[PDB]
Structure formats: structure tokens, C-alpha cells
CSV table of C-alpha atoms and ligand atoms in Angstrom, one decimal:
chain,number,residue,atom,x,y,z
P,1,UNK,CA,24.8,16.9,-16.6
P,2,UNK,CA,21.9,19.4,-16.1
P,3,UNK,CA,21.8,20.6,-12.4
P,4,UNK,CA,19.9,23.7,-11.2
P,5,UNK,CA,20.3,25.0,-7.6
P,6,UNK,CA,18.3,27.5,-5.6
P,7,UNK,CA,19.6,30.8,-4.3
P,8,UNK,CA,20.8,29.6,-0.9
P,9,UNK,CA,22.1,26.4,-2.5
P,10,UNK,CA,19.9,24.2,-0.2
P,11,UNK,CA,17.9,22.8,-3.1
P,12,UNK,CA,19.0,21.1,-6.3
P,13,UNK,CA,17.4,19.4,-9.2
P,14,UNK,CA,19.2,17.3,-11.8
P,15,UNK,CA,17.8,15.8,-14.9
P,16,UNK,CA,17.6,12.1,-15.6
P,17,UNK,CA,15.6,12.5,-18.8
P,18,UNK,CA,13.3,14.8,-20.9
P,19,UNK,CA,10.5,14.6,-18.2
P,20,UNK,CA,12.1,13.3,-15.1
P,21,UNK,CA,14.4,15.0,-12.6
P,22,UNK,CA,15.7,14.2,-9.2
P,23,UNK,CA,15.2,16.8,-6.5
P,24,UNK,CA,17.6,16.9,-3.6
P,25,UNK,CA,17.4,19.0,-0.4
P,26,UNK,CA,19.9,19.6,2.3
P,27,UNK,CA,18.0,19.4,5.5
P,28,UNK,CA,19.1,19.5,9.2
P,29,UNK,CA,19.5,16.1,11.0
P,30,UNK,CA,21.7,15.0,14.0
P,31,UNK,CA,23.5,17.3,13.8
P,32,UNK,CA,24.9,18.1,10.3
P,33,UNK,CA,23.6,18.8,6.8
P,34,UNK,CA,21.8,15.7,5.3
P,35,UNK,CA,20.5,15.3,1.8
P,36,UNK,CA,17.2,13.8,0.9
P,37,UNK,CA,16.0,12.9,-2.6
P,38,UNK,CA,12.8,12.7,-4.5
P,39,UNK,CA,11.5,13.0,-8.2
P,40,UNK,CA,9.9,15.8,-10.2
P,41,UNK,CA,7.8,14.5,-13.1
P,42,UNK,CA,7.1,17.0,-15.8
P,43,UNK,CA,3.9,15.9,-17.3
P,44,UNK,CA,1.4,17.5,-19.6
P,45,UNK,CA,-1.2,17.8,-16.9
P,46,UNK,CA,1.2,19.4,-14.4
P,47,UNK,CA,4.2,18.6,-12.2
P,48,UNK,CA,4.0,15.5,-10.0
P,49,UNK,CA,6.5,15.0,-7.1
P,50,UNK,CA,7.7,11.7,-5.7
P,51,UNK,CA,8.2,12.9,-2.2
P,52,UNK,CA,8.3,16.6,-1.1
P,53,UNK,CA,10.9,17.6,1.5
P,54,UNK,CA,12.1,17.9,5.2
P,55,UNK,CA,9.8,20.7,6.4
P,56,UNK,CA,7.4,23.3,5.0
P,57,UNK,CA,10.0,25.9,4.1
P,58,UNK,CA,11.9,23.6,1.9
P,59,UNK,CA,8.8,22.1,0.4
P,60,UNK,CA,7.5,25.6,-0.5
P,61,UNK,CA,10.9,26.5,-2.0
P,62,UNK,CA,10.9,23.2,-4.0
P,63,UNK,CA,7.4,23.8,-5.4
P,64,UNK,CA,8.3,27.4,-6.3
P,65,UNK,CA,11.4,26.4,-8.1
P,66,UNK,CA,9.8,23.7,-10.3
P,67,UNK,CA,6.7,25.8,-10.9
P,68,UNK,CA,8.8,28.7,-12.2
P,69,UNK,CA,11.1,26.5,-14.3
P,70,UNK,CA,8.6,24.2,-15.9
P,71,UNK,CA,5.8,26.7,-16.2
P,72,UNK,CA,3.0,24.5,-14.8
P,73,UNK,CA,1.5,23.8,-11.3
P,74,UNK,CA,2.5,21.0,-9.0
P,75,UNK,CA,-0.7,19.0,-8.9
P,76,UNK,CA,0.2,15.8,-7.0
P,77,UNK,CA,2.7,14.4,-4.6
P,78,UNK,CA,3.5,10.7,-3.7
P,79,UNK,CA,4.6,10.4,-0.1
P,80,UNK,CA,6.7,7.3,0.3
P,81,UNK,CA,6.6,6.9,4.2
P,82,UNK,CA,5.6,8.8,7.3
P,83,UNK,CA,9.0,10.0,8.6
P,84,UNK,CA,9.4,13.8,8.9
P,85,UNK,CA,11.9,13.7,6.0
P,86,UNK,CA,9.0,12.6,3.6
P,87,UNK,CA,5.8,13.9,5.4
P,88,UNK,CA,7.3,17.3,6.7
P,89,UNK,CA,5.8,19.5,4.0
P,90,UNK,CA,2.3,18.1,4.2
P,91,UNK,CA,0.8,21.2,5.6
P,92,UNK,CA,2.1,23.2,2.5
P,93,UNK,CA,0.6,20.6,0.2
P,94,UNK,CA,-2.8,20.5,1.8
P,95,UNK,CA,-3.2,24.2,2.0
P,96,UNK,CA,-2.2,24.7,-1.7
P,97,UNK,CA,-4.7,22.1,-2.9
P,98,UNK,CA,-1.8,19.7,-3.9
P,99,UNK,CA,-3.1,16.1,-3.7
P,100,UNK,CA,-0.9,14.1,-1.3
P,101,UNK,CA,-1.1,10.4,-2.2
P,102,UNK,CA,-0.1,7.7,0.3
P,103,UNK,CA,-1.0,4.3,1.5
P,104,UNK,CA,-3.6,4.1,4.3
P,105,UNK,CA,-0.9,2.9,6.7
P,106,UNK,CA,1.4,5.9,5.9
P,107,UNK,CA,-1.7,8.2,6.5
P,108,UNK,CA,-2.4,6.5,9.9
P,109,UNK,CA,1.2,6.8,10.9
P,110,UNK,CA,1.4,10.5,9.9
P,111,UNK,CA,-1.6,11.2,12.1
P,112,UNK,CA,-0.2,9.1,14.9
P,113,UNK,CA,3.0,11.2,14.7
P,114,UNK,CA,0.8,14.4,14.7
P,115,UNK,CA,1.0,15.4,11.1
P,116,UNK,CA,-1.9,16.3,8.8
P,117,UNK,CA,-3.0,13.3,6.8
P,118,UNK,CA,-2.3,12.4,3.2
P,119,UNK,CA,-5.0,10.7,1.2
P,120,UNK,CA,-4.4,7.2,2.1
P,121,UNK,CA,-5.5,6.2,-1.4
P,122,UNK,CA,-2.7,3.9,-2.6
P,123,UNK,CA,-3.1,0.1,-2.4
P,124,UNK,CA,-0.3,-2.5,-2.5
P,125,UNK,CA,-0.1,-1.9,-6.2
P,126,UNK,CA,-1.5,1.4,-7.6
P,127,UNK,CA,-1.3,2.5,-11.2
P,128,UNK,CA,-1.6,6.3,-11.8
P,129,UNK,CA,-1.3,8.3,-15.0
P,130,UNK,CA,-0.7,12.0,-15.2
P,131,UNK,CA,-0.8,13.4,-18.7
P,132,UNK,CA,1.2,10.8,-20.6
P,133,UNK,CA,3.3,9.9,-17.5
P,134,UNK,CA,2.7,6.4,-16.1
P,135,UNK,CA,3.4,5.9,-12.4
P,136,UNK,CA,3.2,2.7,-10.4
P,137,UNK,CA,3.3,2.6,-6.6
P,138,UNK,CA,4.3,-0.6,-4.9
P,139,UNK,CA,4.3,-1.7,-1.2
P,140,UNK,CA,6.9,-4.5,-1.0
P,141,UNK,CA,6.6,-5.1,2.8
P,142,UNK,CA,8.3,-3.7,5.8
P,143,UNK,CA,11.9,-2.5,5.8
P,144,UNK,CA,13.3,0.9,6.6
P,145,UNK,CA,9.8,1.5,8.1
P,146,UNK,CA,6.6,-0.5,8.4
P,147,UNK,CA,4.9,1.6,5.6
P,148,UNK,CA,7.7,2.2,3.1
P,149,UNK,CA,6.6,2.2,-0.6
P,150,UNK,CA,8.6,2.3,-3.9
P,151,UNK,CA,7.6,4.2,-7.1
P,152,UNK,CA,8.2,2.8,-10.6
P,153,UNK,CA,8.1,4.6,-13.9
P,154,UNK,CA,7.4,1.9,-16.4
P,155,UNK,CA,8.1,4.1,-19.4
P,156,UNK,CA,11.7,4.7,-18.2
P,157,UNK,CA,12.4,1.6,-16.0
P,158,UNK,CA,13.2,4.1,-13.3
P,159,UNK,CA,12.7,3.0,-9.6
P,160,UNK,CA,12.4,5.5,-6.8
P,161,UNK,CA,13.7,3.4,-3.9
P,162,UNK,CA,13.1,5.9,-1.1
P,163,UNK,CA,14.6,5.0,2.3
P,164,UNK,CA,14.2,1.3,1.7
P,165,UNK,CA,17.2,1.6,-0.6
P,166,UNK,CA,20.6,2.7,0.5
P,167,UNK,CA,23.1,4.5,-1.7
P,168,UNK,CA,26.7,3.2,-2.3
P,169,UNK,CA,28.1,5.7,0.0
P,170,UNK,CA,25.8,4.4,2.9
P,171,UNK,CA,27.9,2.0,5.0
P,172,UNK,CA,25.2,1.0,7.5
P,173,UNK,CA,21.4,1.0,7.6
P,174,UNK,CA,21.0,4.5,9.2
P,175,UNK,CA,18.4,4.8,11.9
P,176,UNK,CA,16.8,1.5,12.5
P,177,UNK,CA,14.4,2.4,15.5
P,178,UNK,CA,11.4,2.1,13.1
P,179,UNK,CA,12.9,-0.6,11.0
P,180,UNK,CA,12.2,-4.3,10.4
P,181,UNK,CA,15.7,-5.8,9.6
P,182,UNK,CA,14.3,-9.3,9.1
P,183,UNK,CA,11.6,-8.4,6.7
P,184,UNK,CA,13.7,-5.7,4.9
P,185,UNK,CA,15.6,-8.4,2.9
P,186,UNK,CA,12.4,-10.0,1.7
P,187,UNK,CA,11.0,-6.5,0.8
P,188,UNK,CA,14.0,-5.7,-1.3
P,189,UNK,CA,13.7,-9.2,-2.9
P,190,UNK,CA,10.0,-8.4,-3.7
P,191,UNK,CA,11.3,-5.3,-5.6
P,192,UNK,CA,14.0,-7.3,-7.5
P,193,UNK,CA,11.3,-9.8,-8.4
P,194,UNK,CA,8.7,-7.3,-9.6
P,195,UNK,CA,11.1,-5.1,-11.6
P,196,UNK,CA,13.5,-7.3,-13.4
P,197,UNK,CA,15.1,-4.7,-15.7
P,198,UNK,CA,16.0,-1.4,-14.0
P,199,UNK,CA,17.6,1.6,-15.7
P,200,UNK,CA,18.2,3.7,-12.7
P,201,UNK,CA,17.4,3.5,-8.9
P,202,UNK,CA,17.0,6.6,-6.8
P,203,UNK,CA,17.9,6.0,-3.1
P,204,UNK,CA,16.2,8.0,-0.3
P,205,UNK,CA,19.5,9.7,0.3
P,206,UNK,CA,22.7,9.8,-1.9
P,207,UNK,CA,23.7,9.3,-5.5
P,208,UNK,CA,21.5,7.7,-8.1
P,209,UNK,CA,22.7,4.1,-9.0
P,210,UNK,CA,21.2,1.0,-10.5
P,211,UNK,CA,20.1,-2.5,-9.4
P,212,UNK,CA,23.4,-2.7,-7.5
P,213,UNK,CA,22.0,-0.3,-4.8
P,214,UNK,CA,19.4,-3.0,-4.0
P,215,UNK,CA,22.1,-5.6,-3.7
P,216,UNK,CA,24.1,-3.2,-1.6
P,217,UNK,CA,21.1,-2.9,0.7
P,218,UNK,CA,20.9,-6.7,1.0
P,219,UNK,CA,24.6,-6.8,2.1
P,220,UNK,CA,24.1,-4.1,4.6
P,221,UNK,CA,21.4,-6.2,6.2
P,222,UNK,CA,23.7,-9.3,6.7
V,301,LIG,O1,16.8,7.0,5.7
V,301,LIG,C1,17.6,7.0,6.6
V,301,LIG,O2,18.3,6.0,7.0
V,301,LIG,C2,17.7,8.3,7.6
V,301,LIG,C3,19.1,9.0,7.5
V,301,LIG,S1,18.7,10.6,7.0
V,301,LIG,C4,17.0,10.7,7.2
V,301,LIG,C5,16.7,11.4,8.5
V,301,LIG,S2,16.6,10.0,9.6
V,301,LIG,C6,15.6,9.0,8.5
V,301,LIG,C7,14.3,9.6,8.2
V,301,LIG,S3,13.9,9.1,6.4
V,301,LIG,N1,16.6,9.2,7.4
V,302,LIG,K1,3.6,4.0,-23.3
V,303,LIG,ZN1,12.5,7.3,6.9
V,304,LIG,ZN1,15.6,8.5,5.0
């Protein structure tokens, strides 16, 4: 049930479990309100985000909300690809001394698109631990973008799909200009192969689902 919104209503967080919430922000795309998801991980060494938000204003507001609520600092963010939706708050992170993890390719792409660079520290498979919280990052191949990664929480069997994974409500692939529609199916299969028992799947946009969201993505690719 538990859902907390900000003043203006533009930001929301909703609990999945004792230490794991989804954050969602309404941003401005072409040309309506469009929601974007990530994760807030409440660990004993601080707050870790899987993705920040659309722009600096929303990222600052997000950080401020979870800092106030959980009474600890945001220490780390995992940036799941280099579109503005994911990388847009990078300047806020760097200036606050928040570590912005990404693959090298995501870092390269950010800079090519004129953003400040995340760390480029993540390999194809990276295993991180913050306090007691275990976090795996996985590059499954190209799909929604060249660089898109997923994030797995092995203690909860929770998969952050990012924009690689479409919600039920999504009835097409979205913007495919940066996409690789042949390789996207294989990428999704690589996820299904690596993570055989999944409790919950967080799509880049839309409502939390399960493994069925990955199967939905495959169908939308046919
Ligand atoms: O993931 C997507 O398909 C689209 C629809 S909403 C958001 C803004 S365009 C792209 C950047 S992640 N993304
Ligand atoms: K454990
Ligand atoms: Zn994207
Ligand atoms: Zn997206």
C-alpha cells in the first residue's frame, strides 16, 4: 500500500519491502506528463538509488524527499542508460558528492550527448554491496538503447528492468531511434536466462509486474 508523494505531487515513492521502494516521477515529454521509475534502497550505509530522474530539479527533490524520510544520505546512484530520462540529474549528483555508477559505454554516451560523466565503473556483471544490501548490475546486450543495463537485488529476487522492459500498459516499443530491435529479444532472453525466479520486475515506465513484463516485451518486438 505505502505511497508517499511530494508537495506538488510530481514525485512519488511506494514501498515494495522493508528496505526497497520504487520512485516515480512525472516529467515532461512530447508533449504530456510521462512517468519514469527507479528504486530507492534503504541500506545501513545510506540510501542508494537505481536511477535518479528527468532533470536536476526533480533529482534534487527526489534526494531531498528520501533523505528527510529515511534520515540518511543518498550515497550512490546506478544509472541504467544515457538517455536524458536517466542521466538528466547527473550534475546534481556530481556536485553533491553522490557516486554515479554506470558502464563505460553509458559514460561515453553521456559525454557524447553533452552530459557530465558518471563513473564508468560497471562491467558486464558487477556485484556491489551497500551496508547489508546486495546489488548486481547486468548488461544483457543492446535493446531499448545500445548501453541499457538491468539491476538485480538477489536478496529479494527483484529486477529493475529499466527501459529495456515495457509495462503491461505499453502497447508499442516507445521511441526506437536509439534502439536495436533485432538484438532486444536476445537481450531480454539473456535476462530470463540469468534470473530464473523473479519476484517483481520494475519497468522503466509504468506499473510494477513480474516475469510477464519480459514476455510482454518479447511480444511487442514481434
Ligand atoms: O523508454 C521509453 O520508451 C521512452 C518513453 S518515455 C521516456 C522518454 S523517451 C525515452 C527515454 S528513456 N523514454
Ligand atoms: K544474504
Ligand atoms: Zn531511454
Ligand atoms: Zn524510458
